[PDB]
Ligand binder design. Structure first.
Ligand SMILES: O=C(O)Cc1ccc(O)cc1
Lengths: 141, 132
């Protein structure tokens, strides 16, 4: 065995943590016919109201051409609508439709159950702390 | 959303470490595997798959290339995996630059916050098992 690095990999910790959430969320998403990437988008559009294409890619962490393809499909499905701003000719905003909002709620409630279970166990204070630290690490640069 | 927060925090780390891994001509997945092997000493294929969060056929491909590069050895003739001498060496020289970038990050957020995050992730993982 070599000498361990000074810092443990926060990266691997982040990856294992999200993957443990996904095994709990995978059957929920499968039944609603929604992928992991699709739900990141759906939950972000619901919670932010709207995001422009560029901000949506950064926050959902999806490569840009792949996001376009996903968006195209979500629009054809009637879940996502494009919003154009009167002060920028190229910039595109995205928002859930009525159908998209309803889908968010019915999936959102199922998903939130595990978040609630963890929160009743870990405590609201710690839960907030974890969310705030992730956001502080994420907003670096 | 802890889910979304987790992936955003990860994407932010990636940007900090990308230049280090690319200069070494190593991918995130390859580095992930090298670290897990280095830090566990020896692992079976399945355990490696689970800890790296990589599906088995995709892992086989990555392992195939790490072996051809002389960094990883399969134990032959359930399959076990181990780093070579060179793989260990690579872990140390890349690992040092990686620790350096972590020191810089820790200076931005603060050591206490970094430790808090590590502690909460560890507590999160132990809640997940308990609930199940
Ligand atoms: O945790 C590490 O080992 C550093 C690292 C972080 C993110 C990434 O994508 C690659 C390496």
């Amino acid at each position: 065995m070599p000498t361990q690095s000074k810092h443990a990999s926060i990266n691997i910790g982040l990856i294992q943590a999200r993957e443990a959430l996904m095994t709990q969320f995978r059957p929920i998403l499968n039944q609603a016919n929604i992928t992991d990437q699709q739900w990141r988008i759906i939950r972000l559009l619901a919670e932010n109201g709207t995001l422009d294409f560029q901000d949506l890619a950064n926050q959902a962490c999806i490569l840009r051409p792949s996001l376009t393809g996903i968006l195209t499909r979500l629009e054809k499905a009637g879940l996502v609508v494009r919003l154009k701003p009167s002060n920028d000719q190229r910039r595109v905003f995205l928002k859930l439709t009525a159908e998209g909002e309803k889908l968010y709620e019915e999936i959102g409630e199922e998903v939130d159950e595990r978040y609630d279970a963890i929160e009743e166990v870990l405590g609201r204070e710690k839960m907030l702390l974890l969310k705030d630290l992730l956001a502080e690490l994420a907003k670096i640069e």
